[PDB]
PDB file of C-alpha atoms and ligand atoms in Angstrom:
ATOM      1  CA  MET A   1     130.215  95.673 100.450  1.00  0.00           C
ATOM      2  CA  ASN A   2     130.751  99.173 101.879  1.00  0.00           C
ATOM      3  CA  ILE A   3     130.156 102.721 101.060  1.00  0.00           C
ATOM      4  CA  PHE A   4     133.035 102.952  98.571  1.00  0.00           C
ATOM      5  CA  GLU A   5     132.402  99.930  96.677  1.00  0.00           C
ATOM      6  CA  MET A   6     128.636 101.122  96.603  1.00  0.00           C
ATOM      7  CA  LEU A   7     129.584 104.288  94.934  1.00  0.00           C
ATOM      8  CA  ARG A   8     131.988 102.877  92.767  1.00  0.00           C
ATOM      9  CA  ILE A   9     129.161 100.778  91.061  1.00  0.00           C
ATOM     10  CA  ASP A  10     126.783 103.592  91.007  1.00  0.00           C
ATOM     11  CA  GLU A  11     129.401 106.262  89.724  1.00  0.00           C
ATOM     12  CA  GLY A  12     131.973 104.354  87.697  1.00  0.00           C
ATOM     13  CA  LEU A  13     135.706 105.365  87.305  1.00  0.00           C
ATOM     14  CA  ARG A  14     136.532 107.692  84.146  1.00  0.00           C
ATOM     15  CA  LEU A  15     139.826 109.389  84.039  1.00  0.00           C
ATOM     16  CA  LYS A  16     138.958 112.361  81.583  1.00  0.00           C
ATOM     17  CA  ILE A  17     136.412 114.730  82.093  1.00  0.00           C
ATOM     18  CA  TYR A  18     132.936 113.756  80.943  1.00  0.00           C
ATOM     19  CA  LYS A  19     129.567 115.061  81.384  1.00  0.00           C
ATOM     20  CA  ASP A  20     127.285 113.389  84.224  1.00  0.00           C
ATOM     21  CA  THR A  21     123.569 112.457  84.132  1.00  0.00           C
ATOM     22  CA  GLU A  22     122.610 115.971  84.612  1.00  0.00           C
ATOM     23  CA  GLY A  23     125.292 117.429  81.742  1.00  0.00           C
ATOM     24  CA  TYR A  24     127.649 118.633  84.212  1.00  0.00           C
ATOM     25  CA  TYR A  25     131.324 118.231  84.088  1.00  0.00           C
ATOM     26  CA  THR A  26     132.732 115.541  86.159  1.00  0.00           C
ATOM     27  CA  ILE A  27     135.693 113.385  86.732  1.00  0.00           C
ATOM     28  CA  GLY A  28     137.000 110.386  88.432  1.00  0.00           C
ATOM     29  CA  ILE A  29     134.319 108.467  90.600  1.00  0.00           C
ATOM     30  CA  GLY A  30     131.455 110.807  90.231  1.00  0.00           C
ATOM     31  CA  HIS A  31     133.618 113.895  91.214  1.00  0.00           C
ATOM     32  CA  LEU A  32     131.414 116.872  90.094  1.00  0.00           C
ATOM     33  CA  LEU A  33     133.820 119.560  88.816  1.00  0.00           C
ATOM     34  CA  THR A  34     131.176 122.280  88.206  1.00  0.00           C
ATOM     35  CA  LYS A  35     127.559 123.264  86.840  1.00  0.00           C
ATOM     36  CA  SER A  36     129.254 125.805  84.464  1.00  0.00           C
ATOM     37  CA  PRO A  37     128.861 124.764  80.648  1.00  0.00           C
ATOM     38  CA  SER A  38     132.201 126.235  80.110  1.00  0.00           C
ATOM     39  CA  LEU A  39     134.819 123.305  79.947  1.00  0.00           C
ATOM     40  CA  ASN A  40     137.318 125.640  80.644  1.00  0.00           C
ATOM     41  CA  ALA A  41     135.800 126.607  84.085  1.00  0.00           C
ATOM     42  CA  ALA A  42     135.671 122.441  84.769  1.00  0.00           C
ATOM     43  CA  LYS A  43     139.316 122.283  83.572  1.00  0.00           C
ATOM     44  CA  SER A  44     140.457 125.029  85.979  1.00  0.00           C
ATOM     45  CA  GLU A  45     138.194 123.399  88.901  1.00  0.00           C
ATOM     46  CA  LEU A  46     140.045 120.040  87.797  1.00  0.00           C
ATOM     47  CA  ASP A  47     143.710 121.680  88.321  1.00  0.00           C
ATOM     48  CA  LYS A  48     142.787 123.389  91.683  1.00  0.00           C
ATOM     49  CA  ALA A  49     141.426 120.089  93.154  1.00  0.00           C
ATOM     50  CA  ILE A  50     144.512 117.888  92.163  1.00  0.00           C
ATOM     51  CA  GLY A  51     146.885 120.486  92.672  1.00  0.00           C
ATOM     52  CA  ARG A  52     148.735 120.534  89.031  1.00  0.00           C
ATOM     53  CA  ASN A  53     147.999 121.480  85.584  1.00  0.00           C
ATOM     54  CA  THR A  54     146.148 118.778  84.233  1.00  0.00           C
ATOM     55  CA  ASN A  55     144.144 119.689  81.032  1.00  0.00           C
ATOM     56  CA  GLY A  56     141.497 117.413  81.906  1.00  0.00           C
ATOM     57  CA  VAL A  57     142.843 113.863  82.433  1.00  0.00           C
ATOM     58  CA  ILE A  58     143.784 112.200  85.679  1.00  0.00           C
ATOM     59  CA  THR A  59     145.440 109.313  87.338  1.00  0.00           C
ATOM     60  CA  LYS A  60     143.607 106.294  88.827  1.00  0.00           C
ATOM     61  CA  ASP A  61     145.387 107.191  92.356  1.00  0.00           C
ATOM     62  CA  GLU A  62     144.231 110.921  91.910  1.00  0.00           C
ATOM     63  CA  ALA A  63     140.484 109.776  91.012  1.00  0.00           C
ATOM     64  CA  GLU A  64     140.625 107.840  94.329  1.00  0.00           C
ATOM     65  CA  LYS A  65     141.907 110.718  96.177  1.00  0.00           C
ATOM     66  CA  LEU A  66     138.968 112.961  95.143  1.00  0.00           C
ATOM     67  CA  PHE A  67     136.630 109.925  95.910  1.00  0.00           C
ATOM     68  CA  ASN A  68     137.994 109.512  99.338  1.00  0.00           C
ATOM     69  CA  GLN A  69     137.559 113.381  99.980  1.00  0.00           C
ATOM     70  CA  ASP A  70     134.168 113.295  98.623  1.00  0.00           C
ATOM     71  CA  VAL A  71     133.049 110.357 100.782  1.00  0.00           C
ATOM     72  CA  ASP A  72     134.338 112.143 103.701  1.00  0.00           C
ATOM     73  CA  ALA A  73     132.661 115.299 102.791  1.00  0.00           C
ATOM     74  CA  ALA A  74     129.382 113.516 102.395  1.00  0.00           C
ATOM     75  CA  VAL A  75     129.594 112.361 105.730  1.00  0.00           C
ATOM     76  CA  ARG A  76     130.878 115.580 107.180  1.00  0.00           C
ATOM     77  CA  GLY A  77     128.034 117.272 105.790  1.00  0.00           C
ATOM     78  CA  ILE A  78     125.341 114.789 107.003  1.00  0.00           C
ATOM     79  CA  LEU A  79     126.887 115.249 110.422  1.00  0.00           C
ATOM     80  CA  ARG A  80     126.841 119.190 110.212  1.00  0.00           C
ATOM     81  CA  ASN A  81     122.948 119.259 109.067  1.00  0.00           C
ATOM     82  CA  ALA A  82     120.543 119.580 111.581  1.00  0.00           C
ATOM     83  CA  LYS A  83     118.017 117.749 109.403  1.00  0.00           C
ATOM     84  CA  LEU A  84     120.276 114.695 108.340  1.00  0.00           C
ATOM     85  CA  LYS A  85     122.128 113.991 111.452  1.00  0.00           C
ATOM     86  CA  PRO A  86     119.341 112.812 113.643  1.00  0.00           C
ATOM     87  CA  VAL A  87     118.088 110.501 110.427  1.00  0.00           C
ATOM     88  CA  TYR A  88     121.722 109.178 109.903  1.00  0.00           C
ATOM     89  CA  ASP A  89     122.274 108.607 113.875  1.00  0.00           C
ATOM     90  CA  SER A  90     119.069 106.629 114.145  1.00  0.00           C
ATOM     91  CA  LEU A  91     120.032 104.308 111.070  1.00  0.00           C
ATOM     92  CA  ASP A  92     122.035 101.050 111.085  1.00  0.00           C
ATOM     93  CA  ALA A  93     125.326 100.941 109.079  1.00  0.00           C
ATOM     94  CA  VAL A  94     123.737  99.620 105.729  1.00  0.00           C
ATOM     95  CA  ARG A  95     121.202 102.259 105.588  1.00  0.00           C
ATOM     96  CA  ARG A  96     123.588 104.856 106.957  1.00  0.00           C
ATOM     97  CA  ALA A  97     125.608 104.062 103.691  1.00  0.00           C
ATOM     98  CA  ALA A  98     122.233 104.493 101.495  1.00  0.00           C
ATOM     99  CA  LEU A  99     121.920 108.303 103.037  1.00  0.00           C
ATOM    100  CA  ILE A 100     125.731 108.997 102.321  1.00  0.00           C
ATOM    101  CA  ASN A 101     124.953 107.787  98.655  1.00  0.00           C
ATOM    102  CA  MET A 102     122.262 110.288  98.362  1.00  0.00           C
ATOM    103  CA  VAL A 103     124.072 113.186  99.547  1.00  0.00           C
ATOM    104  CA  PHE A 104     127.121 112.106  97.378  1.00  0.00           C
ATOM    105  CA  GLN A 105     124.615 112.369  94.286  1.00  0.00           C
ATOM    106  CA  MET A 106     122.660 115.269  95.240  1.00  0.00           C
ATOM    107  CA  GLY A 107     124.435 117.275  98.040  1.00  0.00           C
ATOM    108  CA  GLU A 108     123.652 117.862 101.776  1.00  0.00           C
ATOM    109  CA  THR A 109     121.050 120.494 100.929  1.00  0.00           C
ATOM    110  CA  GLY A 110     119.287 118.469  98.521  1.00  0.00           C
ATOM    111  CA  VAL A 111     118.844 115.398 100.778  1.00  0.00           C
ATOM    112  CA  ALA A 112     117.967 117.515 103.896  1.00  0.00           C
ATOM    113  CA  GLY A 113     115.082 118.833 101.921  1.00  0.00           C
ATOM    114  CA  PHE A 114     113.474 115.245 101.872  1.00  0.00           C
ATOM    115  CA  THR A 115     111.555 116.064 104.968  1.00  0.00           C
ATOM    116  CA  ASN A 116     108.889 113.502 104.401  1.00  0.00           C
ATOM    117  CA  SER A 117     111.162 110.837 103.505  1.00  0.00           C
ATOM    118  CA  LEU A 118     113.394 111.551 106.070  1.00  0.00           C
ATOM    119  CA  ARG A 119     110.599 111.447 108.896  1.00  0.00           C
ATOM    120  CA  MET A 120     109.351 107.897 107.522  1.00  0.00           C
ATOM    121  CA  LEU A 121     113.138 106.628 107.969  1.00  0.00           C
ATOM    122  CA  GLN A 122     113.563 107.943 111.089  1.00  0.00           C
ATOM    123  CA  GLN A 123     110.253 106.296 112.161  1.00  0.00           C
ATOM    124  CA  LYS A 124     111.569 103.038 110.758  1.00  0.00           C
ATOM    125  CA  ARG A 125     108.409 102.611 108.173  1.00  0.00           C
ATOM    126  CA  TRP A 126     110.588 101.278 105.587  1.00  0.00           C
ATOM    127  CA  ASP A 127     108.287 100.136 102.988  1.00  0.00           C
ATOM    128  CA  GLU A 128     106.447 103.584 103.387  1.00  0.00           C
ATOM    129  CA  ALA A 129     109.799 105.578 103.084  1.00  0.00           C
ATOM    130  CA  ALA A 130     110.478 103.555  99.970  1.00  0.00           C
ATOM    131  CA  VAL A 131     107.216 104.413  98.204  1.00  0.00           C
ATOM    132  CA  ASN A 132     107.628 108.131  99.346  1.00  0.00           C
ATOM    133  CA  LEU A 133     111.393 108.397  98.156  1.00  0.00           C
ATOM    134  CA  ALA A 134     110.447 107.332  94.785  1.00  0.00           C
ATOM    135  CA  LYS A 135     108.175 110.533  94.368  1.00  0.00           C
ATOM    136  CA  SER A 136     110.845 112.542  93.282  1.00  0.00           C
ATOM    137  CA  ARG A 137     112.922 114.147  90.467  1.00  0.00           C
ATOM    138  CA  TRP A 138     115.920 111.995  91.880  1.00  0.00           C
ATOM    139  CA  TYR A 139     114.118 108.609  91.155  1.00  0.00           C
ATOM    140  CA  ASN A 140     112.663 109.767  87.835  1.00  0.00           C
ATOM    141  CA  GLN A 141     115.871 111.173  86.434  1.00  0.00           C
ATOM    142  CA  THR A 142     118.037 108.212  87.808  1.00  0.00           C
ATOM    143  CA  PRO A 143     115.655 105.562  88.242  1.00  0.00           C
ATOM    144  CA  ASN A 144     117.771 102.440  88.398  1.00  0.00           C
ATOM    145  CA  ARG A 145     120.396 103.861  90.753  1.00  0.00           C
ATOM    146  CA  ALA A 146     117.478 105.336  92.694  1.00  0.00           C
ATOM    147  CA  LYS A 147     115.953 101.647  92.904  1.00  0.00           C
ATOM    148  CA  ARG A 148     119.268 100.521  94.152  1.00  0.00           C
ATOM    149  CA  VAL A 149     119.587 103.150  97.200  1.00  0.00           C
ATOM    150  CA  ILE A 150     115.741 102.695  98.017  1.00  0.00           C
ATOM    151  CA  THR A 151     116.093  99.187  98.142  1.00  0.00           C
ATOM    152  CA  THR A 152     119.150  99.485 100.636  1.00  0.00           C
ATOM    153  CA  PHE A 153     116.918 101.517 102.632  1.00  0.00           C
ATOM    154  CA  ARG A 154     113.943  99.280 102.597  1.00  0.00           C
ATOM    155  CA  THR A 155     115.719  96.101 103.576  1.00  0.00           C
ATOM    156  CA  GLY A 156     118.826  97.274 105.326  1.00  0.00           C
ATOM    157  CA  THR A 157     120.755  94.868 103.041  1.00  0.00           C
ATOM    158  CA  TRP A 158     123.061  95.109 100.091  1.00  0.00           C
ATOM    159  CA  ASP A 159     121.030  92.753  98.018  1.00  0.00           C
ATOM    160  CA  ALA A 160     120.714  95.667  95.185  1.00  0.00           C
ATOM    161  CA  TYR A 161     124.497  95.692  94.812  1.00  0.00           C
ATOM    162  CA  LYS A 162     125.085  92.000  94.825  1.00  0.00           C
TER     163      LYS A 162
HETATM  164 NA1  LIG B 201     104.253 108.556 100.012  1.00  0.00          NA
HETATM  165 NA1  LIG B 202     120.002 105.333  87.041  1.00  0.00          NA
HETATM  166 NA1  LIG B 203     117.440  93.912  94.611  1.00  0.00          NA
END
């Protein structure tokens, strides 16, 4: 198990534009296109992201390219953020993947706002961090995925993904 396989489990793979859990146009492996309600706006984002006229359908290789870029962007965003980088640096490799997963789903700014959870993770108070992470819109709206990510932070194992 690794961050790519973990996110593939959590995000799935679809090759045509569809709406994510928040109702936002998405493609591939959880590649958010736009929060706009305009499908045309989402298709333009897709064409710009892929570099060709797509009219809403991509290949698996194209989906995997966006996914690679998106995982890279999540790590890059953690490392450039003054609140996330110290937490990331303090974690082991499994829990680092759990933090990348959150940033992939919610964005750098969203995760960096979890001030109290981040402090408990930096303190390595894993059960307390897990309880605190569940007191969130994130957990309430995607509880099964959040439970998997939280179990990864709690245990430092891949038990929730195997
Ligand atoms: Na708490
Ligand atoms: Na869920
Ligand atoms: Na589990």
